[PDB]
Amino acid sequence: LTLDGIKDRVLYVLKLYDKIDPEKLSVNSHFMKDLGLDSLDQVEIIMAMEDEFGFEIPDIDAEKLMCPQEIVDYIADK
Amino acid sequence: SRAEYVVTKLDDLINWARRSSLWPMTFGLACCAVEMMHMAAPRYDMDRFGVVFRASPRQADVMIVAGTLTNKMAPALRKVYDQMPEPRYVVSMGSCANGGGYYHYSYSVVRGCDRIVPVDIYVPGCPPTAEALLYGILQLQRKIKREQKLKIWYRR
Amino acid sequence: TYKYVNKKEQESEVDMKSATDNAARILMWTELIRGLGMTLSYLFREPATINYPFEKGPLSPRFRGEHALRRYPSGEERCIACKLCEAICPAQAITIEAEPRADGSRRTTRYDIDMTKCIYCGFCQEACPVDAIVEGPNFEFSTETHEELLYNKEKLLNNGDKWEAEIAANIQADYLYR
Amino acid sequence: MNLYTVIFINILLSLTLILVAFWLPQMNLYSEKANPYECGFDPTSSARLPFSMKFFLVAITFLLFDLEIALLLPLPWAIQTIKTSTMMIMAFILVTILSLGLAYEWTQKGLEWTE
Amino acid sequence: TSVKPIFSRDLNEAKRRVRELYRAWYREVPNTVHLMQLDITVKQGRDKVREMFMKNAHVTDPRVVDLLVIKGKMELQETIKVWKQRTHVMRFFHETETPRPKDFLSKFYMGHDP
Numbered sequence: 001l002t003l004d005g006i007k008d009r010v011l012y013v014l015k016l017y018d019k020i021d022p023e024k025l026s027v028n029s030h031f032m033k034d035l036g037l038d039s040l041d042q043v044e045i046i047m048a049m050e051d052e053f054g055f056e057i058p059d060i061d062a063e064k065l066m067c068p069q070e071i072v073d074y075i076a077d078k
Numbered sequence: 079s080r081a082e083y084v085v086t087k088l089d090d091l092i093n094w095a096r097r098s099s100l101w102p103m104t105f106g107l108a109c110c111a112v113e114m115m116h117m118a119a120p121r122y123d124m125d126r127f128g129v130v131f132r133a134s135p136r137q138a139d140v141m142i143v144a145g146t147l148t149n150k151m152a153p154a155l156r157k158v159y160d161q162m163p164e165p166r167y168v169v170s171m172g173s174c175a176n177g178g179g180y181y182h183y184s185y186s187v188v189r190g191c192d193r194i195v196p197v198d199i200y201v202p203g204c205p206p207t208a209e210a211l212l213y214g215i216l217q218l219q220r221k222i223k224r225e226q227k228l229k230i231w232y233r234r
Numbered sequence: 235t236y237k238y239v240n241k242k243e244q245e246s247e248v249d250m251k252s253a254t255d256n257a258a259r260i261l262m263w264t265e266l267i268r269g270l271g272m273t274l275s276y277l278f279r280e281p282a283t284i285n286y287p288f289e290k291g292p293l294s295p296r297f298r299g300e301h302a303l304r305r306y307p308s309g310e311e312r313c314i315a316c317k318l319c320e321a322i323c324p325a326q327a328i329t330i331e332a333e334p335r336a337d338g339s340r341r342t343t344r345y346d347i348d349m350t351k352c353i354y355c356g357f358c359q360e361a362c363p364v365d366a367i368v369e370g371p372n373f374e375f376s377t378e379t380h381e382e383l384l385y386n387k388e389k390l391l392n393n394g395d396k397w398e399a400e401i402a403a404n405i406q407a408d409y410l411y412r
Numbered sequence: 413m414n415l416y417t418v419i420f421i422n423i424l425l426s427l428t429l430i431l432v433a434f435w436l437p438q439m440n441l442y443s444e445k446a447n448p449y450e451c452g453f454d455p456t457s458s459a460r461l462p463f464s465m466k467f468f469l470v471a472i473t474f475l476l477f478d479l480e481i482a483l484l485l486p487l488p489w490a491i492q493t494i495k496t497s498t499m500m501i502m503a504f505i506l507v508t509i510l511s512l513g514l515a516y517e518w519t520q521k522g523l524e525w526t527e
Numbered sequence: 528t529s530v531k532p533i534f535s536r537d538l539n540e541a542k543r544r545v546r547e548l549y550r551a552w553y554r555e556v557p558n559t560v561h562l563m564q565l566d567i568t569v570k571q572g573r574d575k576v577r578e579m580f581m582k583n584a585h586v587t588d589p590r591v592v593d594l595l596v597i598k599g600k601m602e603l604q605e606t607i608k609v610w611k612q613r614t615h616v617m618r619f620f621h622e623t624e625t626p627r628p629k630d631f632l633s634k635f636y637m638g639h640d641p
């Protein structure tokens with residue numbers, strides 16, 4: 001379901017978002033471990049995807065999108 | 079000088095018009111507002127001094143704080159006061175408005191309306207009798223009579 | 235026992251005599267003319283207004299107005315710093331300090347009434363065992379600043395000397411009811 | 413020409429009082445003074461939002477009756493005709509269908525405001 | 528140590544309601560700032576939201592987190608419906624209050640308080 005138009009965007013916003021360091025960011029970097037974000041930083045990120053792809057993500061779902069890939073995977077699973 | 083004299087009598091002229099038309103804002107808070115209604119009642123008939131209640135703060139000259147000012151109502155009192163065109167005067171009426179009164183130590187009461195707006199005349203009492211408020215209102219006209227705006231402009 | 239204010243359905247029959255009365259009531263606005271009459275009658279009544287400040291509203295000798303500190307006929311202060319007016323004041327409006335005087339008397343060095351806390355209840359007048367603190371008959375003492383309504387001892391003694399002639403006669407007219 | 417003069421004179425007075433009102437007083441402008449009024453609290457929304465009209469049907473029925481005034485206003489000239497029978501018959505019918513139109517709307521709850 | 532739950536049966540089921548409240552508060556800052564004509568930026572408003580959620584970062588009793596969530600929803604509602612005013616929203620930002628120094632010496636110079 002278009003799996004690299006997604007990759008360009010799901011990582012586009014993560015570049016704009018602050019507390020993520022763009023250079024260290026990798027399409028398979030764990031949000032909590034590698035980058036070192038907080039549970040409330042992830043909530044901010046997931047909402048960012050809502051800005052683009054424009055479709056709500058239930059909290060149950062969003063509490064697993066721990067690195068940029070699953071996002072990409074999740075939306076492809078739209 | 080002649081001009082300084084003319085400015086003095088022009089000062090009396092504009093004061094007189096403001097003394098003779100004080101339009102208080104229809105606005106009372108608690109039991110002190112009941113005695114403010116009695117001053118409007120026939121016996122005292124504040125209307126005979128040129129005192130007319132107007133609902134809108136734009137059309138009002140005077141804000142009489144007639145009752146307790148709580149913290150919840152404090153921002154709203156300031157807002158209607160800001161919207162009063164200038165010149166504008168505040169009469170603080172009653173212990174509650176004067177300094178908190180019976181509720182001075184309450185967690186929810188502003189300890190005096192003069193923390194929120196500038197006050198011209200303080201009227202003591204809980205409540206002040208309608209005459210006491212009337213004396214205070216007429217003491218505000220004498221304060222306006224002593225106004226010297228035009229003369230001070232001349233000496234600038 | 236109870237009564238009906240707005241019950242009347244003991245229905246009668248509309249006679250031609252009565253129907254024409256209902257119509258004249260509706261077409262000729264008769265009850266609205268009756269109301270115009272009542273306000274016309276008031277126009278020719280004497281107004282209830284009094285000519286303030288040249289005329290004053292009636293008051294009784296009990297009237298609770300401005301405070302004052304009284305003296306004895308010899309000029310000695312009545313207040314003995316018992317602090318009962320302070321213990322009763324519903325508003326905590328009275329502050330008092332005392333010490334032995336130079337002649338050994340029990341007298342106050344401080345006596346304040348924050349007239350913006352006072353609710354003018356007159357309770358201090360009741361609590362005083364020697365009629366030292368009273369509420370005089372003055373009610374026309376509005377100021378132009380908050381600070382002028384914080385009365386210290388000098389101010390209250392001055393009100394006592396100012397108003398004594400009238401305070402003494404009001405107590406004389408009312409102490410037998412107390 | 414007179415009727416033009418008297419109305420400019422009226423306009424100039426209304427203008428002249430408008431200028432004095434704005435340039436004579438001493439003005440002190442700040443944001444909290446010039447906000448809109450709403451009984452002491454901030455407005456919760458602009459006043460330009462739609463405002464439902466519960467009497468809209470009567471509003472457009474005013475238009476239809478308004479033009480039926482335009483047809484009755486020539487009557488003062490019309491009662492000067494020789495054909496009095498015609499003038500009167502046309503007048504009676506015109507007023508009667510305005511009345512019949514009004515009765516129909518009244519009975520159809522058309523004069524009632526929508527809840 | 529057994530007690531009736533309010534809503535959540537343990538801290539994990541309660542954090543679900545916390546993040547859902549943080550979402551709602553996060554979506555509403557740009558409106559509060561726009562409708563109340565606040566003189567702040569959205570980023571500055573949203574930071575303040577995060578600061579208040581971290582003020583209660585040590586709570587662990589699930590019943591307590593239920594009543595903080597209950598209160599926070601009430602606070603959110605007071606803001607969305609514009610029952611609060613500029614003054615009320617701006618009170619979170621303590622803009623007129625000088626903050627008391629947290630070092631011993633400065634406290635020692637300033638008065639008797641600890």
Ligand SMILES: CCCCCCCCCCCCO[C@@H]1O[C@H](CO)[C@@H](O[C@H]2O[C@H](CO)[C@@H](O)[C@H](O)[C@H]2O)[C@H](O)[C@H]1O
Nearest residue numbers: 494495496497498499500501502503504505506508509
């Ligand atoms: C569908 C809607 C219908 C509802 C409305 C119906 C209205 C009908 C009105 C009928 C009334 C006409 O009334 C009629 O008036 C005319 C003139 O005015 C009279 O006519 C009389 O006067 C005219 C002049 O005025 C003379 O020139 C004429 O010779 C003489 O007959 C008739 O004798 C009378 O019958």
Ligand SMILES: C/C=C(/C)[C@H](O)[C@H](C)/C=C(C)/C=C/C/C(C)=C/Cc1[nH]c(OC)c(OC)c(=O)c1C
Nearest residue numbers: 103104105106107108109111112114115118130131
């Ligand atoms: C219309 C114009 C006039 C001149 C009128 O004659 C009078 C003078 C104005 C009136 C009646 C009110 C003036 C101010 C005000 C808003 C009072 C508060 C109030 N108002 C009450 O009722 C009306 C109460 O009822 C129990 C109250 O408790 C309270 C606290």
Ligand code: SF4
Nearest residue numbers: 109172173174204205
């Ligand atoms: S001062 Fe007394 S009368 Fe006036 S509002 Fe307060 S309690 Fe009521």
Ligand code: SF4
Nearest residue numbers: 323352353355356358
């Ligand atoms: S009148 Fe009442 S409130 Fe006032 S000083 Fe006396 S006891 Fe206190």
Ligand code: SF4
Nearest residue numbers: 313314316317319362
């Ligand atoms: S005024 Fe009366 S009650 Fe108060 S301290 Fe003096 S003697 Fe006692």
